[PDB]
Amino acid sequence: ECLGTIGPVTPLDASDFALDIRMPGVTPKESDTYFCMSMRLPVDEEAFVIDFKPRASMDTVHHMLLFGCNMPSSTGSYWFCDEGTCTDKANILYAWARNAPPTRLPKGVGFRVGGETGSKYFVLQVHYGDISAFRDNHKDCSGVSVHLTRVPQPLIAGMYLMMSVDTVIPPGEKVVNADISCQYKMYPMHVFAYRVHTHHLGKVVSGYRVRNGQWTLIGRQNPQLPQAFYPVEHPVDVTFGDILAARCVFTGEGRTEATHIGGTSSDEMCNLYIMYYMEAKYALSFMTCTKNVAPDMFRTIPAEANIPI
Numbered sequence: 001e002c003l004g005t006i007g008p009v010t011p012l013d014a015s016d017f018a019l020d021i022r023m024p025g026v027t028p029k030e031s032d033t034y035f036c037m038s039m040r041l042p043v044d045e046e047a048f049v050i051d052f053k054p055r056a057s058m059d060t061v062h063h064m065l066l067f068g069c070n071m072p073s074s075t076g077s078y079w080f081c082d083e084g085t086c087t088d089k090a091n092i093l094y095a096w097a098r099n100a101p102p103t104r105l106p107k108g109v110g111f112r113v114g115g116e117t118g119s120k121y122f123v124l125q126v127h128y129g130d131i132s133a134f135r136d137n138h139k140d141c142s143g144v145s146v147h148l149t150r151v152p153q154p155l156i157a158g159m160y161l162m163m164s165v166d167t168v169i170p171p172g173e174k175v176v177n178a179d180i181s182c183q184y185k186m187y188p189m190h191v192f193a194y195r196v197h198t199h200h201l202g203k204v205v206s207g208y209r210v211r212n213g214q215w216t217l218i219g220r221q222n223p224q225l226p227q228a229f230y231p232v233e234h235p236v237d238v239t240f241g242d243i244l245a246a247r248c249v250f251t252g253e254g255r256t257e258a259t260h261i262g263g264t265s266s267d268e269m270c271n272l273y274i275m276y277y278m279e280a281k282y283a284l285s286f287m288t289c290t291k292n293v294a295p296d297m298f299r300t301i302p303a304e305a306n307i308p309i
């Protein structure tokens, strides 16, 4: 329920506090609606996000996403966001899915936020489902409770985002692959969770670490299944000289015109969010790959990447 008089900040101890990021009592008028809101961090100095607790209605909320960024798309109370979340790069921290219960951060692991370089804002995206549980006209305050601490964490959580930019899916085309690859050139990262994201043309999304020619599965998922962060089968380290490679399999069947990458439901996306940790003294919070630097390498991609899970 809504917090009313106590507000969104709960003190836990001298150095920690819970921040509740909730909808300002909204009432979705249509189904399949996407709401956004923002919260400036209460603290200017560096803090660590070490836990998330969902505060979702168990009937109306389909999924929730939380981001860190410096400039949310809109100011004010709330806005409608078909994942038009931030104006700068939105750094995903958390996904909650109705049908896919989230996995916790490992102990000792946190995202760095605030300070000179970290996110100054959280942006909450809530996707509402069938909205039949709104005939009472009630106000919804679904969201997330975030556990922040100033105690520096020995391990820092980050995001390696792989995304297609140039994909064109001609109408009626049975199979279109969107391939993404980059050489990794940082200190070692350990992947512990992944999220896949396409729109309605996506069949299967797979991500791999390629080392000396060998393909090691990070994650492989049907993007039409709930788009939560799923744990990695085996914590995969990615080290200097490694190549990260991803493939989204698309279809143009059902479409009368070409589908390219874009920000609407009728466009497509090929996103693979690889959540990792790094040693605190080596850590960087975000890396991005929007390229295909080793296209011929995909000829030895495992067969599982081409058949839907």
Ligand SMILES: [Cu+2]
Residues within 6 Å of the ligand: 062, 063, 064, 127
């Ligand atoms: Cu949803």
Ligand SMILES: [Cu+2]
Residues within 6 Å of the ligand: 083, 197, 198, 199, 268, 269
């Ligand atoms: Cu999208």
Ligand code: NA
Residues within 6 Å of the ligand: 082, 083, 084, 262, 263, 264, 265
């Ligand atoms: Na979008």
Ligand code: NA
Residues within 6 Å of the ligand: 298, 299, 300, 301
């Ligand atoms: Na191939």
Ligand code: NI
Residues within 6 Å of the ligand: 190, 237
């Ligand atoms: Ni390791």
